[PDB]
Design an enzyme around this catalytic site. Sequence first.
Site, short mmCIF file in Angstrom:
data_model
loop_
_atom_site.label_atom_id
_atom_site.label_comp_id
_atom_site.label_asym_id
_atom_site.label_seq_id
_atom_site.Cartn_x
_atom_site.Cartn_y
_atom_site.Cartn_z
CG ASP B 53 -1.88 2.97 -1.25
OD1 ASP B 53 -2.19 2.39 -2.31
OD2 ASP B 53 -2.02 4.20 -1.10
N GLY B 109 0.02 14.15 -8.58
CA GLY B 109 0.72 13.26 -9.50
C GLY B 109 2.05 12.73 -9.01
CB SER B 111 1.00 9.29 -5.14
OG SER B 111 0.19 10.39 -4.74
#
Lengths: 181, 151, 16, 22
Positions: B53, B109, B111
């Site tokens: 990720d 918000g 991340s």
Amino acid sequence: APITAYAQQTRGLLGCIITSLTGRDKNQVEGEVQIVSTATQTFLATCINGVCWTVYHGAGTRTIASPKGPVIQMYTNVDQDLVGWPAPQGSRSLTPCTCGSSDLYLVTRHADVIPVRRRGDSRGSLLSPRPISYLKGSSGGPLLCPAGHAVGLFRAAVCTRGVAKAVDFIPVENLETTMRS
Amino acid sequence: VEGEVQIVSTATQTFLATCINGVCWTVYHGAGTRTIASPKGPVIQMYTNVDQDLVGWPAPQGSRSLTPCTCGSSDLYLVTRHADVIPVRRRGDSRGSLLSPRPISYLKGSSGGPLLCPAGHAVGLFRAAVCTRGVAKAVDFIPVENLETTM
Amino acid sequence: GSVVIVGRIVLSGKPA
Amino acid sequence: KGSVVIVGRIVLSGKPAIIPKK
Ligand SMILES: *[C@](O)(C(N)=O)[C@H](CC1CCC1)NC(=O)[C@@H]1[C@@H]2[C@H](CN1C(=O)[C@@H](NC(=O)NC1(C)CCCCC1)C(C)(C)C)C2(C)C
Ligand SMILES: [Zn+2]
Ligand SMILES: [Zn+2]
């Protein structure tokens, strides 16, 4: 919140020199650590408990230029390698460590905080060794415990081949002792 | 002044990015394989790792890199997109427990944001919040090592 | 699309 | 010898902040 720091230069060569002589500095002061200079060298000075402490082998027995002219040292201890003037009006003081944490953080002249593992009364190992030149100018800087408290003041580097592997510092205790003397 | 963490946004969501080692990292689930804007045009990702990720472009202007953690501390601190600092105890290589669980909106918000150790050094990138009934109790993160390796 | 930086955060809190 | 002169400062008390737009 973690230990983070920043730096700001307040004056250059010429202003420094005039002020060194004049002994009168009119700049506003802010911060826990002051970047200090003599005609021969530049280092740091840390304000702990209302007192602006620094390393004797740098400040010598000199006075600190201030808005009211030169200010004489409050404490001078050639053996402890410490000197201290009344902290400048506008500065903020740190307080000594009350947790005997052996995980210290050295705040350098460039406002970088590097970890050092306490391995003695006056030593710590640089978890990430850095060259000597990088540590230059950081004498008199603070060694903070994770909570952000003064444990000591960077005095000398333990190095070889030009790389600092460890640091020698003046424990915050010698300050108390020096004041009591 | 120069910022280490950039607040970015796409057509839909908004999230954070962190510059570490000269690279501006963020979460693939936010950027994807998308390009980053610049006054000279979009610039491509130097790294893309859907698996971890993780994605990274060359650090932008007005930014300054963050230093990887070298002390191996478990007393971590998360920085949100509103500059709030949240103490997180490291429970694992990719997991940490907030010392004070907070409503998901509070971590929303953020991340891609940084997970700092007591020296302000980067330990990992906030990957995702682990919330129970709308309360973020712990968080998921990509350790700097993955980044150090990826690059 | 494209990722656009809409703001920045300086961790030290430097006003400079 | 001249006085020691303050040529800069290092501020630890600062906290993460969104850089204001000008
Ligand atoms: C600071 O005063 C400064 N100018 O920033 C300076 C910082 C050093 C890191 C790289 C320079 N300290 C300093 O010059 C001290 C000072 C002299 C010698 N010294 C050193 O740091 C020297 N190291 C050293 O002598 N280390 C040992 C042998 C002795 C002290 C205990 C540790 C082992 C160096 C210049 C790096 C060779 C004083 C100690 C009075
Ligand atoms: Zn302490
Ligand atoms: Zn660390």
